[PDB]
Amino acid sequence: FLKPKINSFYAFEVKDAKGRTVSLEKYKGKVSLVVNVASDCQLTDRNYLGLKELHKEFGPSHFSVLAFPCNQFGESEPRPSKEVESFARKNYGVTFPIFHKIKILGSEGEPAFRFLVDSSKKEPRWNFWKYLVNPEGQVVKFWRPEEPIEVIRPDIAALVRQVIIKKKEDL
C-alpha cells in the first residue's frame, strides 16, 4: 500500500487569525501569492506595502495574497495571531486574509505550507518568502525575500489574465 499525496494547496484547511477553521478550497480557480509574514523585522514594511499593492491591483475576485504569520525567523512575529491581524489592518489597511500563526520549519510544519515547500523544493530561510499558486492549486513560481515587486507583478498579471480569459471563453 502506497499512501496518497495531496495534489493541491487549495485542498487544505487552515485556522484564520481568530482561530476558526477555513477551507482553502474557497480559493480554487483563483491565483494566490502565498507568503510567510512577520510584523517585527526589517522587511515588514516594504512587504506589507507591496503585497497591498498587488492585492489591490489584481484581487480579490481572481487573485489573493494569502498571509501566514510565523515566528521562526529571528522571532519576528512575537504577538498573538489576533494582534498580528490587527497590526496589519491598522498599519496598512490590508484586506487580504491573515491566517493564524503557524510553524513552517521543524517536526510540526503546517501541512498547507509544507505543500508549498515540497513542490518548490525551497523551504523559507527568512520571513517573506513567496509562492505563486495557480487556479488548480499548483506552485508555479517562488521568490526569495530579496526579490522586488517589478519581477513578481508580471507573473501574477499573466495568470490573472488567463483566469479572466478562460472564464469569459468557457461555459
Swiss-Prot record:
It is found in: Membrane. Keywords: Acetylation, Membrane, Oxidoreductase, Peroxidase, Transmembrane, Transmembrane helix. It catalyses: 2 glutathione + H2O2 = glutathione disulfide + 2 H2O. GO terms for cellular component: endoplasmic reticulum lumen; membrane. Its EC number is 1.11.1.9. GO terms for biological process: cellular response to oxidative stress. Disulfide bonds: none annotated. It is a single-pass membrane protein. Its main location: membrane. GO terms for molecular function: glutathione peroxidase activity; peroxidase activity. The active site is at C41. It comes from the Eukaryota. Belongs to the glutathione peroxidase family. This is Probable glutathione peroxidase 8. The chain holds residues 39 to 209 of 209 of the full protein.
